[PDB]
């Protein structure tokens, strides 16, 4: 039948789905919000926002600005290749690792698309607790990446 002649490749549709979901997520809050404007949902815990993270967390490694767009894009490019062959190698019934690889792959490709098209990464989820602290904004791609890491970290038990 068709299901076996493609192998573990039909799992890529979950990767394709996450990429699409994340791209429409960014396209909405971009053309809907202003930069750093926040739409309060839970007054002291959650809001929508429009922060553009240029990857300025690792700015301590150099006295330049702009190379994160490339160093991180290359990371996603190479990491995606090793996570494509990894899914090909898997077997039927390893549906835990097939979802986990598809989740991590889909998110990283959605953020690789950002850095290749627009220098920054769109983020729109400000989880906070009053003025006490504010977690950095993220997107559907980060959500897919983080879940897949958990699924892989709970596969070594």
């Amino acid at each position: 039948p068709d299901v076996d002649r493609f192998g573990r490749l039909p799992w890529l549709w979950i990767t394709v789905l996450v990429f699409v979901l994340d791209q429409v997520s960014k396209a909405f809050f971009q053309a809907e919000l202003s930069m750093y404007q926040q739409i309060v949902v839970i007054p002291d815990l959650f809001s929508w926002t429009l922060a553009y993270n240029t990857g300025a967390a690792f700015s301590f490694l150099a006295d330049s600005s702009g190379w994160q767009r490339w160093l991180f894009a290359l990371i996603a490019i190479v990491v995606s290749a090793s996570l494509v062959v990894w899914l090909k190698r898997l077997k039927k019934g390893e549906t835990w690792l097939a979802i986990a690889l598809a989740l991590v792959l889909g998110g990283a490709l959605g953020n690789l698309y950002d850095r290749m098209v627009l220098g920054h990464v769109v983020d729109f989820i400000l989880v906070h607790w009053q003025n006490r602290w504010y977690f950095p904004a993220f997107n559907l791609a980060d959500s897919a990446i983080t879940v897949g890491a958990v699924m892989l970290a709970l596969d070594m038990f």
């Binding site: 990857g55 998110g107 990283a108 953020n111 990464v121 980060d142 990446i145």
Partner: peptide, 4 residues
Amino acid sequence: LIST
């Protein structure tokens, strides 16, 4: 991979 992630935003940061």
